[model samples]
Target: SVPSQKTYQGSYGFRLGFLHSGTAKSVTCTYSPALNKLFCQLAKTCPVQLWVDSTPPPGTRVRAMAIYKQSQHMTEVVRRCPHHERCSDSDGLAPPQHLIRVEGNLRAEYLDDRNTFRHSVVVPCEPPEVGSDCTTIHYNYMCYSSCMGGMNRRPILTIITLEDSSGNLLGRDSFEVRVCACPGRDRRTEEENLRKK
Candidate 1:
C-alpha cells in the first residue's frame, strides 16, 4: 500500500522521485500548506517506484542475520562465560574450519509483535586475513521465547559483513538458524508437567 502523503527526503539530502512505467512519466511534487508536506500528484492511480542510490555495486555482498534465543544450554553458557574465558579460548573463538564462519558483529532484539528480528551494525569485523581472499564472520545473540506456549519453532538470521584494508565492504554471506521454542521439553512428560502446573 502506498502512503497517503508523499515527499520523502533521505538523510543525504536526496529528494524522492516517482517514475511511471506505463508512459515513462515522472510524477510532479507539490507543496501542501494544509498538510505541511510535499505531495506527489499523478493523473491516475499508477505504480510508483522510489529511485535511490541504495543498491550497492555489483560483486558487493551485504548480509543479514536474525538472532533469537532457541537454546537454553548455549544461552546459559554465554551468560555465564566471561569475556576473559572467551578470549583465552582461541580454539573456541576461531571460525569453523570446514565452514567459513563470521563471529561477533551484531546485536539484535526479538520483536514480539512482528515475530521478526532486526539489528544495527555495531562494530565492524577485522579486515580479510593478510593472505586470504575470504573472511569468516560470526555473531552471538541470545533470545528466550517462552511467551508462546506449546510446540513452537522460530528462525534467526545472522549476517556477516566484510571490508578491505581501506574499509571498503566486499562480498557478504549469511546463515539462517531455526530453533525450537522450548529446549528439552521432550525429555519430560508433558502430561505430568501440565497436571502439576
Candidate 2:
C-alpha cells in the first residue's frame, strides 16, 4: 500500500505496494468529483457503502437517490436511465427522496443483497433541467463502510423530505454513517484489533 509520488492511482494495477520495507510514497487518488453528499448516523448497526462518481463536474445538476424513513418516496436513482436496475419515475420528483434508502453501502448483508438503496447522484450537468429545482437539499459525503464492527463511531446525519400532491417539495435527502477518525488512523490501535484469517 505504498503509492504516493504525489497522488493519482487511477486504474490500481501496480502503482506501488508495500507500506513498509523501504517506504515510498507518491499518490493522488481522491477523485470523487460528484456533487452533494453529506449524511451520518449510526452507533451500533454498522455496514454501509456508497459512491456515485463516474463523471459529473461542470455546470451543476446533481442527481442521486436512496431513501427511507417510512418511505414517502424515493427508492432508486443510483445511475439513472436505461436498464438501470429497472428504472422508476412514478411521476418523477424525488429530490432527496428515500424509503429506507441508502447510497453505496450499509451493512445488513449488502442491504439484503441489493434490495433498495437507490443511487443516482453525480451532478454538474448545466442548468437547463438538471436536478430541476423547487425543494429540499443536502450533501457532504454520504456514507461508506462495506464492512465494519468496532472502533468506528462519529456518524449521525439525517435530512428527510417529501412533497407532492401539489405541496411541491417532492423529495430531498441526506444521510451519513461510519463514526469518527479513520483517515489518519487511531481507534485504540493494536492494528485496530487485527482480524482476517
Which candidate has the highest TM-score of all?
1
Question: How much is 20 displaced in model 2, in angstroms?
Answer: 19
Superposed by TM-score, candidate 2 places the C-alpha of residue 72 at a distance from the truth, in angstroms, of 25
Error of 2 at 181 (Å): 12
User: How does model 2 fare in lDDT?
Assistant: 0.25
> What lDDT would candidate 1 get against the real structure?
0.28
The per-residue C-alpha lDDT of model 2 at residue 179 equals 25
Per-model TM values vs. the true structure: 0.26, 0.19
lDDT of each: 0.28, 0.25
**What are the root-mean-square deviations of the candidates from the true structure over C-alphas?**
20.3, 17.2
lDDT of 2 by residue, 121-169 (tens): 3322222235523222223232232212211222223333222223223
Estimate the TM-score for candidate 1: 0.26
